């Protein structure tokens, strides 16, 4: 138990978690565009001129 | 005021017999002067009037 000074280390291992990327890199999934306003069907001339 | 930034003082309470009647038998209830448009460019008031007339006629409510 003299606890002498040992030599300098050769290198460094570093352990850390890696993320999973099987999900991302996929084609994007955007929010679907709301439709442009379309005229309602069944619009008729309700007003007829008097006389 | 309208909903487009067009404020305005009432100048005159104009009679209904003196008001310009349409061919439908209808007077307006507010007259607007068209010179509030060019310098101010509130085109959405023209679209709101066309849209509100369609909404009244067809019985709808427009977006």
From Swiss-Prot, chain A:
Superkingdom to which the source organism belongs: Eukaryota
Coiled coil: none
Phosphoserine PTM positions: 26, 34
Composition bias, Pro residues: 29-41
Locations listed in the record: Nucleus, Nucleolus; Chromosome
Disordered, as annotated region: 18-41
Function (record text): Component of RNA polymerase I (Pol I), a DNA-dependent RNA polymerase which synthesizes ribosomal RNA precursors using the four ribonucleoside triphosphates as substrates. Involved in UBTF-activated transcription, presumably at a step following PIC formation.
Similarity field: Belongs to the eukaryotic RPA34 RNA polymerase subunit family.
Protein name per UniProt: DNA-directed RNA polymerase I subunit RPA34
Boundaries of the shown chain within the full protein: 103 to 153 of 510
Curated annotation (Swiss-Prot), chain B:
UniProt subcellular location: Nucleus, Nucleolus; Chromosome
Chain residues that bind RNA: 7
Similarity comment: family membership: Belongs to the RNA polymerase beta chain family.
Reported disease: Treacher Collins syndrome 4: A form of Treacher Collins syndrome, a disorder of craniofacial development. Treacher Collins syndrome is characterized by a combination of bilateral downward slanting of the palpebral fissures, colobomas of the lower eyelids with a paucity of eyelashes medial to the defect, hypoplasia of the facial bones, cleft palate, malformation of the external ears, atresia of the external auditory canals, and bilateral conductive hearing loss. TCS4 inheritance pattern is autosomal dominant.
Function: Catalytic core component of RNA polymerase I (Pol I), a DNA-dependent RNA polymerase which synthesizes ribosomal RNA precursors using the four ribonucleoside triphosphates as substrates. Transcribes 47S pre-rRNAs from multicopy rRNA gene clusters, giving rise to 5.8S, 18S and 28S ribosomal RNAs. Pol I-mediated transcription cycle proceeds through transcription initiation, transcription elongation and transcription termination stages.
Domain comment quoted from the record: The active site comprises the fork loops, the loops and the rudder that stabilize the transcription bubble and assist polymerase translocation.
Quaternary structure, from the entry: Component of the RNA polymerase I (Pol I) complex consisting of 13 subunits: a ten-subunit catalytic core composed of POLR1A/RPA1, POLR1B/RPA2, POLR1C/RPAC1, POLR1D/RPAC2, POLR1H/RPA12, POLR2E/RPABC1, POLR2F/RPABC2, POLR2H/RPABC3, POLR2K/RPABC4 and POLR2L/RPABC5; a mobile stalk subunit POLR1F/RPA43 protruding from the core and additional subunits homologous to general transcription factors POLR1E/RPA49 and POLR1G/RPA34. Part of Pol I pre-initiation complex (PIC), in which Pol I core assembles with RRN3 and promoter-bound UTBF and SL1/TIF-IB complex.
Stated name of the protein: DNA-directed RNA polymerase I subunit RPA2
């Amino acid at each position: 138990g003299g606890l002498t000074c040992a030599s300098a280390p050769q290198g460094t291992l570093r352990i850390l978690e890696g993320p999973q990327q099987s999900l991302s890199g996929s084609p994007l999934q955007p929010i679907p565009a709301s439709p442009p306003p379309q005229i309602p069907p069944g619009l008729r001339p309700r007003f007829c001129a008097f006389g | 005021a309208s909903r487009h930034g067009q404020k305005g003082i009432l100048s005159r309470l104009w009679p209904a017999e003196d008001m310009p009647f349409t061919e439908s038998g209808m007077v307006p209830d507010i007259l607007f002067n068209p010179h509030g448009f060019p310098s101010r460019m509130t085109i959405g008031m023209l679209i709101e009037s066309m849209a509100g007339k369609s909404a009244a006629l067809h019985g709808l409510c427009h977006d």
